Design a protein around this ligand. Structure first.
Ligand code: AL3
Ligand code: HG
Ligand code: ZN
Length: 256
């Protein structure tokens, strides 16, 4: 079924998920000159102090770190949002080379990877109900550039070896997501969708201005993952990103 290869890649998704051609699809190019500064946007409130991570899983398209979302432990509020959004998982999209891998681009600049911390609106009771709503999810996206190593990232990198293939998971408790944030919380925001099937248009996207840098040996580890399951032919998990979709009459507001 879907994936990122020539035969089942982004350009084929519309056949099974017609919403791929919809009106608020993601990712988009952020054009910094056309984004409107909106001084009514409140500051973001990232409360990741009580975060409880549980495990890391290679799901065949990325690896996800799942968090216990049964109580308001790690939440996002403020910014463009109304209400409390709970952290449920985070994952990355990366490239086969350092010049590609982000999903969102800024003035057409692609970064080496992009981190998505996925939150759902607690108003709706569970994640499944939240993906039925136009303001059901908020994903915080952070660009990664290659430079110095990110200390907070290394714990994830050291575990990727035990989850090499599709369907492996490993326990991964006590990871603190705060070590993945940039210094500044300045952002662009716009209404959008999930960037992988089922491509539902449930998401308020918050994309931070400031990228974090990771080393080349750290992103190199990402690239060793496999799309396939154990015993299947090896396909390296690289380039698991969707190209920018048309903005078609949405405006990207900026908090700065
Ligand atoms: N790339 S991205 O940030 O826009 C996201 C992709 C996926 C996300 S967020 S999800 O965890 O919410 N989930 C979506 C759903 C699961 C069940 C019903 S819909 C898995 C998706 O692959
Ligand atoms: Hg929706
Ligand atoms: Zn994503």
């Amino acid at each position: 079924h879907w994936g990122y290869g020539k035969h089942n890649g982004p350009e084929h998704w519309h056949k099974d998920f017609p919403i791929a051609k919809g009106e608020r699809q993601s990712p988009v190019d952020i054009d910094t000159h056309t984004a409107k500064y909106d001084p009514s946007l409140k500051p973001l409130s990232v409360s990741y102090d009580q975060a409880t991570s549980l495990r890391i899983l290679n799901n065949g398209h990325a690896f996800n770190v799942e968090f216990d979302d049964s109580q308001d432990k790690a939440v996002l509020k403020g910014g463009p949002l109304d209400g409390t959004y709970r952290l449920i998982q985070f994952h990355f999209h990366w490239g086969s080379l350092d010049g590609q891998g982000s999903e969102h681009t800024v003035d057409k600049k692609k970064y080496a990877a992009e981190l998505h911390l996925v939150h759902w609106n607690t108003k709706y009771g569970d994640f499944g109900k939240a993906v039925q709503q136009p303001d059901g999810l908020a994903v915080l996206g952070i660009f990664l550039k290659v430079g110095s190593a990110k200390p907070g990232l290394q714990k994830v990198v050291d575990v990727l070896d035990s989850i090499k293939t599709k369907g492996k998971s490993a326990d991964f408790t006590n990871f603190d997501p705060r070590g993945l944030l940039p210094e500044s919380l300045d952002y662009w925001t716009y209404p959008g969708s999930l960037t992988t099937p089922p491509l539902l248009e449930c998401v308020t996207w918050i994309v931070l201005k400031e990228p974090i840098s990771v080393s080349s040996e750290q992103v190199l580890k990402f690239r060793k993952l496999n799309f396939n399951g154990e015993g299947e032919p090896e396909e390296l998990m690289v380039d698991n990103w969707r190209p920018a979709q048309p903005l078609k009459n949405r405006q990207i507001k900026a908090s700065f």
